[PDB]
Amino acid sequence: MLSPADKTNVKAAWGKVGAHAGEYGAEALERMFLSFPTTKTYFPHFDLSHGSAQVKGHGKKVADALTNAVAHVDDMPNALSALSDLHAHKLRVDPVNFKLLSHCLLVTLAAHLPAEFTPAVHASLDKFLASVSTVLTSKYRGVLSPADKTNVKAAWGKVGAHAGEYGAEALERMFLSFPTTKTYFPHFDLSHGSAQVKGHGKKVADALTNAVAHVDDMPNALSALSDLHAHKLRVDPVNFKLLSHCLLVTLAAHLPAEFTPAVHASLDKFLASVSTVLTSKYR
Amino acid sequence: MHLTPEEKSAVTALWGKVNVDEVGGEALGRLLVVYPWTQRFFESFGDLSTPDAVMGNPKVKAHGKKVLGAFSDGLAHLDNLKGTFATLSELHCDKLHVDPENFRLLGKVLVCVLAHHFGKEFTPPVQAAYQKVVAGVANALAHKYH
Amino acid sequence: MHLTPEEKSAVTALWGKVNVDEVGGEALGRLLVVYPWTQRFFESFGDLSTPDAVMGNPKVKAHGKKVLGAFSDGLAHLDNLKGTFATLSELHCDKLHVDPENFRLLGKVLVCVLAHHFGKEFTPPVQAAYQKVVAGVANALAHKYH
Ligand code: HEM
Ligand code: HEM
Numbered sequence: 016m017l018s019p020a021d022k023t024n025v026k027a028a029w030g031k032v033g034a035h036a037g038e039y040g041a042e043a044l045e046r047m048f049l050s051f052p053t054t055k056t057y058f059p060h061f062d063l064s065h066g067s068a069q070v071k072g073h074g075k076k077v078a079d080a081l082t083n084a085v086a087h088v089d090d091m092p093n094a095l096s097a098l099s100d101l102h103a104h105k106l107r108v109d110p111v112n113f114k115l116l117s118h119c120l121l122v123t124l125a126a127h128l129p130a131e132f133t134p135a136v137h138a139s140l141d142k143f144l145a146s147v148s149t150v151l152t153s154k155y156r157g158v159l160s161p162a163d164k165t166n167v168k169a170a171w172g173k174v175g176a177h178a179g180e181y182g183a184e185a186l187e188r189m190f191l192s193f194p195t196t197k198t199y200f201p202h203f204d205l206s207h208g209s210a211q212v213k214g215h216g217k218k219v220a221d222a223l224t225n226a227v228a229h230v231d232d233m234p235n236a237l238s239a240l241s242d243l244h245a246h247k248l249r250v251d252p253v254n255f256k257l258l259s260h261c262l263l264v265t266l267a268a269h270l271p272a273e274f275t276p277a278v279h280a281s282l283d284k285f286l287a288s289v290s291t292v293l294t295s296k297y298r
Numbered sequence: 299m300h301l302t303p304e305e306k307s308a309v310t311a312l313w314g315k316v317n318v319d320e321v322g323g324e325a326l327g328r329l330l331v332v333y334p335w336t337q338r339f340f341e342s343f344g345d346l347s348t349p350d351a352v353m354g355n356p357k358v359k360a361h362g363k364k365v366l367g368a369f370s371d372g373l374a375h376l377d378n379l380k381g382t383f384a385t386l387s388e389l390h391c392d393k394l395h396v397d398p399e400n401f402r403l404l405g406k407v408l409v410c411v412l413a414h415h416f417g418k419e420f421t422p423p424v425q426a427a428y429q430k431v432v433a434g435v436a437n438a439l440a441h442k443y444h
Numbered sequence: 445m446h447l448t449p450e451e452k453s454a455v456t457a458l459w460g461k462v463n464v465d466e467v468g469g470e471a472l473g474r475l476l477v478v479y480p481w482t483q484r485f486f487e488s489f490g491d492l493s494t495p496d497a498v499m500g501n502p503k504v505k506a507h508g509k510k511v512l513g514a515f516s517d518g519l520a521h522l523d524n525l526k527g528t529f530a531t532l533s534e535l536h537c538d539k540l541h542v543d544p545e546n547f548r549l550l551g552k553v554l555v556c557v558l559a560h561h562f563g564k565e566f567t568p569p570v571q572a573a574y575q576k577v578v579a580g581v582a583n584a585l586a587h588k589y590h
């Protein structure tokens with residue numbers, strides 16, 4: 016993830032911020048509340064008026080956390096554990112808002128470090144902030160509990176030799192429903208019932224069968240598959256939630272009595288995990 | 299929004315078989331059972347521990363129908379959901395404080411219900427016309443935010 | 445997108461102090477340096493191995509004036525971004541094969557560049573006006589995808 020060169024660029028830039036960390040934090044928050052108002056729903060109790068006293072306070076606490084992160088850059092997850100339980104478990108903040116804050120943090124830094132905001136430093140800072148987010152967004156809906164393990168098997172098993180058949184139907188439902196995904200298969204004949212989609216559809220379900228078989232160690236199992244997507248192709252992460260929704264609709268259209276709320280929830284948790292495995296190497 | 303006469307006839311066609319009531323609670327209960335955190339908004343109901351607690355809880359059902367109703371209403375004014383969901387959009391922002399990014403979870407849960415209760419009938423081209431409809435409704439609900 | 449008149453007035457006022465040839469080159473150098481995977485689309489530009497090379501690369505600079513030239517147009521026709529970015533939408537979809545999720549990456553880098561050049565003058569309200577602009581531009585440019 017972060018390279019030694021990256022660590023160095025961070026430490027230096029944050030070093031230059033210095034005693035202003037406190038005020039830059041209140042500014043990033045204000046900019047955010049102003050550019051992305053939907054974020055305000057997480058602070059219904061605060062006084063978000065300009066120059067507010069409550070905002071000056073939280074900004075400093077947010078700043079102290081980045082200093083903690085910058086100071087323990089080698090073990091981010093450790094030093095930020097409590098901060099993670101809070102945003103994930105207590106607060107329940109959707110991961111998409113971390114991208115909005117980080118953004119307003121970089122904008123603040125850029126406007127205050129004229130000489131320092133080089134493209135190289137801009138790049139190293141954007142990765143750090145993305146790491147901090149991943150860490151505070153880690154322990155959300157996670158872990159395949161033993162009950163899910165059963166569900167995924169008690170359901171995938173009930174697919175059988177109709178796996179390649181369903182994986183092809185998942186792909187078509189995605190291409191039709193979400194047209195932008197075709198930007199990854201431009202040379203294919205994405206037409207209904209094509210041999211490309213069918214020949215490809217069986218591979219997806221074969222890798223999914225394998226993921227179920229190795230449900231407790233997908234990270235090893237899918238290693239070369241994650242390299243393909245995250246590195247050789249660079250598929251945008253959000254696309255994976257599209258392929259996942261479509262597999263659920265297909266699965267649910269073919270195995271109804273078996274698609275109970277309990278079964279549903281577990282397949283959603285499994286597919287969410289598969290996606291993350293193929294995601295990882297992206298940054 | 300932009301619906302082709304064909305998909306503006308396919309959507310309404312299949313909805314004419316939708317039991318808004320039972321489907322209203324099938325969708326809402328799953329939201330509560332599939333994306334647990336959303337439960338912090340509905341304690342007003344009661345016991346939401348087990349999926350059996352959820353689907354059986356009568357508050358969830360009762361509310362689920364009030365929701366699939368506004369949805370049906372949005373379907374009568376398919377090309378102006380901003381005006382039909384304006385009030386509700388003010389309610390969810392000011393009173394309820396819901397990050398609009400949740401509106402999308404109900405969208406994918408409802409579609410799955412349509413797939414479950416129609417299987418074969420809920421063909422790929424139908425799904426598509428539906429994806430468009432829920433997205434249009436989500437953007438209407440998130441419209442009055444500020 | 446809906447910007448107020450004073451927001452419209454602020455955006456344009458500031459755009460006037462902008463040196464398109466200068467900012468366009470830097471906005472694009474940053475995209476390729478900060479989101480290095482997007483350079484997969486610019487293999488023909490030459491050497492893009494070091495940040496020093498990217499920013500100094502002649503093709504990168506030339507392409508940026510074009511990019512920001514399109515932008516000033518979008519700003520010059522703010523009440524119709526779709527009719528201005530239609531050719532461009534069709535091109536990025538059909539000819540180039542760009543996932544529209546990458547559009548937001550460019551807008552992000554533009555805001556950071558404007559902030560870097562304007563510093564203090566790039567106030568929060570002024571950033572908000574601009575956030576509306578780039579979200580509108582990316583939306584119009586992602587319209588002819590099919
Ligand atoms: C780079 C990511 C972030 C960092 C480093 C961060 C840091 C912090 C810190 C240090 C606190 C103080 C917690 C305490 O004193 O117990 C906190 C609280 C909180 N954060 Fe974050 N946070 C981040 C992103 C977010 C986002 C994106 C949201 C939602 C927009 C959010 C919402 C909140 C809320 C609602 C509180 C508590 C407010 C209260 O005291 O009632 N945080 N955060
Ligand atoms: C549920 C997650 C997914 C799984 C398990 C999966 C699995 C696979 C597998 C097994 C291959 C075949 C490897 C090969 O021999 O080329 C592959 C290739 C590929 N995947 Fe995925 N994939 C998933 C999601 C996605 C998504 C969402 C996209 C983009 C819409 C994507 C785009 C591609 C492309 C473009 C290729 C290469 C096709 C080619 O060889 O021309 N994948 N995928």
Ligand code: HEM
Binds near residue numbers: 336390394402
């Ligand atoms: C996206 C589709 C949605 C629509 C159209 C919708 C519709 C409704 C309707 C019609 C009501 C009843 C309001 C009345 O009394 O007149 C309501 C209430 C409510 N909605 Fe939504 N809603 C949606 C999504 C959500 C989501 C995703 C959440 C939160 C995760 C949410 C949370 C609430 C809450 C907390 C209430 C209050 C119920 C109570 O009194 O306890 N809604 N909604």
Ligand code: HEM
Binds near residue numbers: 485486
């Ligand atoms: C954010 C809005 C965007 C605008 C305003 C924009 C604008 C433009 C313009 C003006 C051209 C025309 C060049 C010509 O016809 O001679 C172009 C070409 C192109 N754009 Fe974009 N673009 C956008 C986003 C993207 C993004 C994010 C990518 C993907 C990383 C991208 C990749 C390309 C490529 C590779 C070309 C072809 C360049 C060539 O001729 O080699 N664009 N774009």
Ligand SMILES: [C-]#N
Binds near residue numbers: 077
């Ligand atoms: C953090 N707010």
Ligand SMILES: [C-]#N
Binds near residue numbers: 219
């Ligand atoms: C890969 N689909």
Ligand SMILES: [C-]#N
Binds near residue numbers: 365
């Ligand atoms: C209302 N859900």
Ligand SMILES: [C-]#N
Binds near residue numbers: 511
């Ligand atoms: C486009 N650059």
